[PDB]
Ligand binder design. Structure first.
Ligand SMILES: Cc1c(C=O)c(-c2nnc3c4c(C[n+]5cc6c(C)n(C)c(C)c6c(Cl)n5)n(C)c(C)c4cnn23)c(C)n1C
Length: 330
């Protein structure tokens, strides 16, 4: 089996991407944030505290003939931005792009934090990290990918995120028409439950490539690229007037600037992020200060190759017995 679904930016900045997912019988279609940095499939639901729902589409398990309460199971998660959600669990049929899993754990939110309520466009998350991070208690549950894997033609999924445009998540096959050149594969550590790998270095604009090992995670759920402070300082030093603002929460730059590209290494290969991809627009409406797309990971504890980096590539999440990651230009 295979599946293929289009993923669409939620706004003009690519702050996140949503992918339609069919849950239950008859299908209830919810738009979920596919997140390779977490491992819970959770949804706004008929059980979500009413004051915490504001425009999202909800899953109603009582209207699904295939929904079953997973008795006694609860979940609770916090994310890297400080947001959180929690609730109980059903099993139901879940389909993505024509690929169907029966008995998938669908985590129904009873509570969500304010950032979720305030974003009408995201109806939940679909985690694609390793199932060891799944928060369901007392019986940990498997991700959609983990459940589908043995049925897939090949035990892989791919992320092809667009810059200010839709893109694609594929399951079970590698679309050889979706990238240029060859895919470079690189080793993954699953020790922390993430798609964790080591970049071989970086360049700023047309500058020389600096060979240096940068350990980080491929995280489709994260908007920005978070790298060591040394690397990030070297990037922003090439932008006149750029500075790190503690009041804003990171590097900002004059909206009149032309941003340089940023290159990261994958083995002996190179992925080039165009400067435009690093522009996240005015810090507040009408401001001439713009928020940067490359930020320091200091204080996070891990480097994060988020959407800014991943959207510059065709990315293979290879879930074979020894997982690996592949990157191609496109
Ligand atoms: C350590 C870490 C992160 C790790 O991942 C992280 C981050 N970065 N984007 C996202 C997240 C997103 C994606 N996302 C980002 C958004 C931004 C920048 N804006 C303005 C809006 C309206 C957004 C929405 Cl709705 N969605 N979502 C949905 C969740 C649950 C996230 C959690 N963390 N997150 C931050 C800010 N930090 C410090």
């Amino acid at each position: 089996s295979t599946g293929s679904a289009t993923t669409t930016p939620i706004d003009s900045l690519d702050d996140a991407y949503i992918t339609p997912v069919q849950i239950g019988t008859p299908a209830q279609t919810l738009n979920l944030d596919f997140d390779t940095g977490s491992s819970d499939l959770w949804v706004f639901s008929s059980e979500t505290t009413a004051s915490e729902v504001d425009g999202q589409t909800i899953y109603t398990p009582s209207k699904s003939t295939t929904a079953k309460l997973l008795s006694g199971a609860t979940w609770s998660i916090s994310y890297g931005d400080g947001s959180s959600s929690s609730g109980d669990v059903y099993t139901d049929t879940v389909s993505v792009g024509g690929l169907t899993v029966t008995g998938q754990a669908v985590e129904s939110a009873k509570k969500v934090s304010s950032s979720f309520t305030e974003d009408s466009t995201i109806d939940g998350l679909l985690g694609l990290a390793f199932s060891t991070l799944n928060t369901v208690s007392p019986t940990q549950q498997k991700t959609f990918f983990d459940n589908a894997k043995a049925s897939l033609d090949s035990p892989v999924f791919t992320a092809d995120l667009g810059y200010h445009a839709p893109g694609t998540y594929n399951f079970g096959f590698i679309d050889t028409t979706a990238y240029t050149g060859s895919i470079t594969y690189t080793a993954v550590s699953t020790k922390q439950g993430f798609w964790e790998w080591t970049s071989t270095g970086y360049a700023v604009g047309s500058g020389t490539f600096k060979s240096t090992s940068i350990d980080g995670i491929a995280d489709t759920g994260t908007t920005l690229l978070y790298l060591p402070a040394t690397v990030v300082s070297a990037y922003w030093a090439q932008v006149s007037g750029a500075k790190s603002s503690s009041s804003v929460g990171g590097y900002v730059f004059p909206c009149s600037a032309t941003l340089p590209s940023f290159t990261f290494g994958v083995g002996s290969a190179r992925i080039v992020i165009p400067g435009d991809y690093i522009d996240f627009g005015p810090i507040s409406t009408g401001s001439s200060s713009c928020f940067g797309g490359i930020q320091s990971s200091a204080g996070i504890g891990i480097n994060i190759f988020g959407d800014v980096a991943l959207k510059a590539a065709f990315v293979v999440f290879n879930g074979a017995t020894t997982p690996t990651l592949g990157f191609a230009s496109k």
